[PDB]
RNA sequence: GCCUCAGGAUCUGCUUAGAGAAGGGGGCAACUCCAUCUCAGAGCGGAGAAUUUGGACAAACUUGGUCAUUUAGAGGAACUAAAAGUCGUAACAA
């Protein structure tokens, strides 16, 4: 019916908020640059992949607000969130040894 | 009972196959991919009990027939038997 397509519209709208946080935090290693570590840029990208895939969407939008609060200084937000995720015990510090 | 003609309860796999949507991904108006619970619907199948066509092997039973060996029998004709039964004295002596 039309109702199922309207629900599909609602669900893709809801999914739109989820995707762009995780990909904007992908890009924020590039707009804030790799902090002198483009040699381990791939390591930075996989580690922040673990960061965004270990968290929830409310601290995704909180960290998004924090990284548009400082566009060239997102590394403090990344290391802070790394400290929170290793304090949570969900994720190991050896995997995120660069920011922790 | 065995071998074959069938038979198909039942069970399983593969390819899709269309749909609901879970859920994620990428261009971010589009669109595409990847998973999932479900089933229409299609073949490709494979194993497959009960039952069943025909064949041969054929126990056992019935029917006679036949062989072999025992066995009943009124009655009959025996033969033998046994210290003195009766009739005659055929034979040994020409």
Question: Could you tell me the fold of the domain covering A2-95?
Answer: Helicase, Ruva Protein; domain 3 (1.10.8)
DSSP assignment of A57-84 equals: HHHHHHHHHHHHH-SS-THHHHHHHHHH
Cβ proximity of A98 and A43 under 8 Å: yes
Tell me which nucleotides of strand B come within 7 A of a protein CB. Answer: 20-28
- 3-class DSSP assignment, residue A13: helix
Token pair for A46: 């996989």
Q: How far apart are CA A29 and CA A13, in angstroms?
A: 26
Radius of gyration of chain A (CA): 16
Q: How far apart are CA A9 and CA A18, in angstroms?
A: 15
- 3-class DSSP assignment, residue A19: helix
Cβ proximity of A59 and A77 under 8 Å: no
* Structure determination method: cryo-EM
- Whole-number Å distance, CA A49 to C1' B92? 162
Closest CA to A97 of A84, A81, A82, A77: A82
Q: Where does residue A89 rank: exposed (0-12), middle (13-18), buried (19+ CB within 10 A)?
A: exposed
- Whole-number Å distance, CA A68 to C1' B2? 90
- Four-residue CA torsion sign, A55, A74, A80, A69: negative
What are the residue boundaries of the structural domains of chain A, listed by start? Answer: 2-95
């Amino acid at each position: 019916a039309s109702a199922k397509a309207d629900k599909k519209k609602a669900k893709e709208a809801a999914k739109a908020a989820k995707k762009k946080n995780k990909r904007a935090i992908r890009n924020s290693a590039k707009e804030a640059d790799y902090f002198g570590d483009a040699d381990k840029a791939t390591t930075i990208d996989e580690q922040v992949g673990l960061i965004v895939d270990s968290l929830n969407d409310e601290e995704l939008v909180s960290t998004a607000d924090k990284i548009k609060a400082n566009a060239a200084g997102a590394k403090e937000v990344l290391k802070e969130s790394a400290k929170t995720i290793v304090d949570s015990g969900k994720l190991p510090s050896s995997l995120l040894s660069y920011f922790v």
